[PDB]
Design an enzyme around this catalytic site. Structure first.
Site, PDB file in Angstrom:
ATOM      1  N   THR C  43       0.855  -1.188   0.000  1.00  0.00           N
ATOM      2  CA  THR C  43       0.000   0.000   0.000  1.00  0.00           C
ATOM      3  C   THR C  43       0.913   1.269   0.000  1.00  0.00           C
ATOM      4  O   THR C  43       1.975   1.248  -0.642  1.00  0.00           O
ATOM      5  CB  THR C  43      -1.108  -0.076   1.064  1.00  0.00           C
ATOM      6  OG1 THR C  43      -0.544  -0.200   2.365  1.00  0.00           O
ATOM      7  CG2 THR C  43      -2.090  -1.201   0.782  1.00  0.00           C
ATOM      8  N   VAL C  45       0.843   4.466   2.859  1.00  0.00           N
ATOM      9  CA  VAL C  45       1.317   5.006   4.143  1.00  0.00           C
ATOM     10  C   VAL C  45       2.156   3.954   4.893  1.00  0.00           C
ATOM     11  O   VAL C  45       3.164   4.311   5.501  1.00  0.00           O
ATOM     12  CB  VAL C  45       0.140   5.531   5.025  1.00  0.00           C
ATOM     13  CG1 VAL C  45       0.600   5.907   6.444  1.00  0.00           C
ATOM     14  CG2 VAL C  45      -0.573   6.702   4.360  1.00  0.00           C
ATOM     15  N   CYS C  46       1.739   2.677   4.850  1.00  0.00           N
ATOM     16  CA  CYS C  46       2.389   1.570   5.561  1.00  0.00           C
ATOM     17  C   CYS C  46       3.922   1.491   5.349  1.00  0.00           C
ATOM     18  O   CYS C  46       4.622   1.466   6.361  1.00  0.00           O
ATOM     19  CB  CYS C  46       1.708   0.249   5.226  1.00  0.00           C
ATOM     20  SG  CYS C  46      -0.100   0.289   5.365  1.00  0.00           S
ATOM     21  N   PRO C  47       4.477   1.490   4.100  1.00  0.00           N
ATOM     22  CA  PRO C  47       5.950   1.429   3.942  1.00  0.00           C
ATOM     23  C   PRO C  47       6.719   2.622   4.507  1.00  0.00           C
ATOM     24  O   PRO C  47       7.803   2.430   5.037  1.00  0.00           O
ATOM     25  CB  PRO C  47       6.147   1.331   2.420  1.00  0.00           C
ATOM     26  CG  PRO C  47       4.904   1.858   1.834  1.00  0.00           C
ATOM     27  CD  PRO C  47       3.806   1.487   2.785  1.00  0.00           C
ATOM     28  N   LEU C  50       6.960   2.013   8.134  1.00  0.00           N
ATOM     29  CA  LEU C  50       7.838   0.870   8.366  1.00  0.00           C
ATOM     30  C   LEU C  50       9.312   1.249   8.124  1.00  0.00           C
ATOM     31  O   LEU C  50      10.189   0.776   8.844  1.00  0.00           O
ATOM     32  CB  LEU C  50       7.395  -0.342   7.520  1.00  0.00           C
ATOM     33  CG  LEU C  50       6.038  -0.982   7.910  1.00  0.00           C
ATOM     34  CD1 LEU C  50       5.505  -1.877   6.816  1.00  0.00           C
ATOM     35  CD2 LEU C  50       6.135  -1.771   9.189  1.00  0.00           C
TER      36      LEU C  50
END
Ligand SMILES: [Cl-]
Ligand SMILES: [Cl-]
Ligand SMILES: [Cl-]
Ligand SMILES: [Cl-]
Ligand SMILES: [Cl-]
Ligand SMILES: [Cl-]
Ligand SMILES: [Cl-]
Ligand SMILES: [Cl-]
Ligand SMILES: [Cl-]
Ligand SMILES: [Cl-]
Ligand SMILES: [K+]
Ligand SMILES: [K+]
Ligand SMILES: [K+]
Ligand SMILES: [K+]
Ligand SMILES: [K+]
Lengths: 186, 186, 186, 186, 186, 186, 186, 163, 186, 163
Positions: C43, C45-47, C50
């Protein structure tokens, strides 16, 4: 089993030919549909089966048959898999994402301790009735050619009420016509 | 489905090669078993499927596989059918009678409004675990050559725990070995 | 909220530095842990979040803090994402796969209509007690500088019983000593 | 967690700038709200956090954000604490009294064995939806600079639908546009 | 009412003469105890009643009677109130804090819609038995002199079994000695 | 307690000034009422309390207050007691008989193992709301002068809604006016 | 027993004189019916009882009595049995198949551990009321001439209300006229 | 039906050959038994049926078969009926009284809206197993020659299973 | 009715010959007892029935019969009634008070809407078995001489098992000997 | 007890003066009624008690009082008993048969382990209200002169309430 039962309502996101779409039971109404369940994206037996279905997709479409592959992975993961694998890249049918597990559970096909669907294939007619079911263990691959044979027999029986397709029946073979006269003769 | 679940205990009377016997789950312990369900004796698609299984019964016995055909008719009816049909007369496997429907319900295969079993086949291993399931609608006959291919793949995976059989796998073809490196490379 | 509660036991597969591993509650006993939940692999925002945690990972390993990122995707998908993205390829911490949703549900962090976890972070002490919680909306990204400040304050309070970290506490700043004389004096 | 849920209706008394008032859900309709829970009046960490929020209060009022601090003490106690402490005397926002525990329980934020709320902060939008949550342990103080960053990112996402704030988002920094083309590209 | 019932177990924090202490039912065993409930600290009728009890505390102690004032406020608030009010400053008995409401609910004395205790006073003997109850409405003040009269009559009856104290009885007055002979004579 | 709750409907027979009558809750509507419970006719502490109330009955009637004494004896027994005791003969208020115990249970005042009511007094206003409660143990007589003081304070607060009567309040003494300014200044 | 109860609705398939038909309770309305239950077709015993009813079937039809033999076998099996056996070939009445056991359970005649009906015969009048019942163990023959006698007596009493048929009654013999004067006279 | 079930324990008073006796299930053990239910003493079909069984009793006793007639009347009433009717006076088998209806209900044979037993006959073997059941409507009398034929058939199959 | 049932345990207070006593079922063991229930003391009717039992009490004691009169009034009321009335003053047997209604409910003799017992008399043998019962409405006198006759007959049958007392039986009259030959003879 | 309760609806067959009639609660309306229960016809205390009530029946009919004797036997059995016993032959009131036990149970008067009614007498007024109840053990006969005295007392209080 779920044989001779009507499919339940569902609403899911899917990856299909470079776009994200919504699939519901309303897309299946008036069509022949194959729900091809598999446990996980980026795994091993799963891509080989999906590719074999992809090889028969042109013929399946000629026969009015839609294919929906389904796993508990998201539609985002299906796109990544489609872009990175030459077997998945040849898929032209809808790759449904079932992260809630609801569609998988509609078909009683969840491995509840893994959160992954079992290797189950369901043939659904235009009235939503399940006419053929095939389920295999984690290590046993399914064969698209026998699914095609079954779809053709399910289509023949729908078109020829009063007839039935006996064991090993293929296009252009003898069919039985149930009657009192035929009872105990075969 | 009942995929990867253990068979439940049962005790049924059967007709096998001219004699009546009792068959229970203990008779399946340590062997490969095929539970072949069909709706009724003295009907039409049922004999073609049963005869087709009888043609592969020497190969199945060479593979350590026992066959149990099941319907809700009695063992008396199976015997009579065996004496009057040229097709049923070639059955050398046990023809189980399930008039109480208990064996059929164990396999969740009863048409409750008819008192007959659906056209379902289950492949069960020596530990009582169901490894492959096939169910078809009333007019669609099953094909024993596909059943045999699934038994062979089931036997291979049991004999090679860290291997899996891909789509269209036949004896001798290239198998897959699930690992971190094979992820997304097919 | 789950603040000051004990983490529940779990058993999940994960991807970590080119290898698949099993992580349980037992692996967190005696260590400080950060459970970093996010909705989905591949997706937007997630990376970034992370990657931000990965940037502060040497500092976290020096403080005895282990990081466990979590999503309802499988570990196979995390391995593929690690290979696919330059942001994710820099993650040296364990990427847990939670397809059953059990680890997510232990932290009451499931979006039940989506089958995806919310953007939540839990700081867990060596005794399994949650000392800090942060949950943001689908479009709002978290910031690791906040997490580290809260982590350091959690570490100070545990190593100095009888003292408490006031608002905006950083290393070297003044701390309060809860007592009767101090009641209503601040 | 309660992320992306609607606040429940409430009716509580409060102290605000030398006057007693009634606050309900109706007073938050159309405004941005910060519900700042803390365990008890006349303690140690609680005033430092409440003072830190008071310092950023002109900035919050400029952004259309209302502050409502909450504890299970009465409004009479908040008035006395306002008169007693120089830190608390600078609070110009509403100090809600929640002796029934109902407002605390609406936010699932009660320490049921103590009758005191946990140190939790909720960002609520004009439509009553929780967009950010922060819970810290009894000895760990919260920081308003974090709250304001999260508030500004919440305001950006609402005023720019089709965009998302990545990790460490500040005013003027780049934002992501969720799409199919961007899946696995970051 | 709770008349002639045994008090229930409890464990609460209290402010008593510049220190914080724990009070349980074990402190009441073998003593005469007055549980003096009131709705809230920093209010109006509440301090006047507590001060009137404080005026009789020396005599109450001479008679083996302990006093426990109780509200749903914390022991921290009781200290602040003790320091800021000249009426509360004269209290030498334990000021119990009941923020969980458990002690108040043991005595069936919660105003459940306010989270405040009602104006109830209970006289408890050395065996834990409730011998006198007085409850007044929000606006009606209680009088310590009548409580003293009642404590003295409860102590006289405990010491003189076979006797009873008639209406308006005070120290050094005629008592009735129940008998068959006395039936219908008064 | 039943403080600030409404009296429940009842229908009882009574002896009042030489005649038998029915008394119901409708007879209390619009008036101040005293429900004076006692355990048994022809006993010892009971007559002293009832006679003491009869001595204040002219003042109570001057204040608009009705008296109802209640026991589980019948109205026949009350009449007989009234004819044989010099003390009971001076009662001019209704002596209610409650042999079913229903009026006693409405007030939650039954000794269930004895079939007698406890020594409980309730002050009920013209709206049926209980404004003061007093309960004493078997051997402790009540004092009507305290009852009268509580009725007067109850009448004052009803006549001056924004005022409250502090501890030891008598007609004409300094009352309190609950407000923000009076908080913590007593 | 089910004596003097009304038959319940049913819908079954049957073999009758070379054709397959549907039988329901509506086919029994206005007629005399015999429900003749038996355990199973194709057993080794000669079906003398069914053959004996067939020998009397012309006489039964002259008396307006329809015959339905019932077992839990299918109508397909009945047709095969009818072709294979000289005794069964004499049957011209309907052979009902009851594979669900529902018609058998309506007559409370199922051997639940076998899935077979007991050897029960029920005589049903034109209003659906059961007038005679006979149940025998295996080897205890049901005599069709005793069945005819019973039917004739049932038809006689239906046509002569006020008369009853004594023991051993046959057409032409004297009947009894229930009356007061006949009480104790026989 | 109750076919192939074991009879349940019971304890009832009966009239038999001028005396009152107690009959329980222990008296049926190792014997063939006929439980012959009828609705009411001093009625119409009941005596003709009971008299017909009395005409065959000597023969049934030659076959090792005991007879128990049962109605919801008392053993006192059976004694009176035995003294006043010429038909009943011929009975030498036990007339069981069942006023609680317990024996009738063990055989699921009560007309619950009448408090009378239905016209049901049960043939019971030496092991207590019910081998033959016959039930007829209020207006239809039973035939004792058919009962004897069935009893002889039941004894033959017991002695020679499988023929 | 409760005829031929055993009395239930009880524990009550009573007035007896100027003293207060406790009566329990153990006081009835080995004796003949009469429980004489009545609605209320001090009613306007002359208590002729209780007086009539008192007139026969010497004879009852000669016959080993104890008398307990029972009402829901207290033992205090019974003593007052005994002092005020010439009829009641003749009573030398125990006057049981039953304010809980428990002894009255054991004999299923409570008028639940009144809290009074019905006018019932129970004759109890030495083993606790009820042998005679009489219940009358008000004004239908219970005659103590009919009670004596009944007691004498009950004592006779207890001493002569095998004999029964016919209608109108008195000492000296002939009895019946239940036998087979006596059936239909009277 | 059932004192001061209304009798419940019923429908039973009875023997009365050589004929079989149906008696229901509608036949008791506007009349004084005696429901006289006893355990069994063709027994011992039962006829002496029933005969004693028959000796007072003319007097009870002069007082507007109807009598209904009740047992769990059938009306057929009562007719037989009326023809065979000299005591029962004197009865001119209705002998109700109650084989279902429904009338007995309406009066809560069944010995459930015997299927026989207890020796209970209920006096019932013209409005159906039970005014007097008497119950005696199996061995104790009732006295009809005491029943008449109570009935006269019940009629006096009905006519003159409060004296
Ligand atoms: Cl399925
Ligand atoms: Cl399945
Ligand atoms: Cl949480
Ligand atoms: Cl939350
Ligand atoms: Cl209380
Ligand atoms: Cl109360
Ligand atoms: Cl039946
Ligand atoms: Cl049956
Ligand atoms: Cl009773
Ligand atoms: Cl009764
Ligand atoms: K079947
Ligand atoms: K998933
Ligand atoms: K509080
Ligand atoms: K009472
Ligand atoms: K009966």
């Amino acid at each position: 089993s779920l044989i001779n039962t009507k499919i339940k309502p569902f609403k899911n996101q899917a990856f299909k030919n470079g776009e994200f779409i919504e699939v519901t039971e309303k897309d299946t109404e008036g069509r022949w549909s194959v729900f091809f369940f598999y446990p996980a994206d980026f795994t091993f037996v799963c891509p080989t089966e999906l590719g074999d279905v992809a090889d028969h997709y042109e013929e399946l479409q000629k026969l009015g048959v839609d294919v929906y592959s389904v796993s508990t992975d998201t539609h985002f993961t299906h796109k990544a898999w489609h872009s990175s694998s030459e077997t998945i890249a040849k898929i032209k049918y809808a790759m449904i994402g079932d992260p809630t597990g609801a569609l998988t559970r509609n078909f009683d096909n969840m491995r509840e301790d893994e959160g992954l669907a079992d290797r189950a294939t369901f043939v659904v007619d235009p009235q939503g009735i399940i006419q053929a079911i095939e389920v295999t263990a984690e290590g046993i691959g399914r064969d698209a050619s026998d699914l095609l044979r079954k779809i053709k027999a399910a289509q023949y029986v729908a078109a020829h009420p009063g007839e039935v397709c006996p064991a090993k029946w293929k296009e252009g073979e003898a069919t039985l016509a149930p009657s009192l006269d035929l009872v105990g003769k075969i």
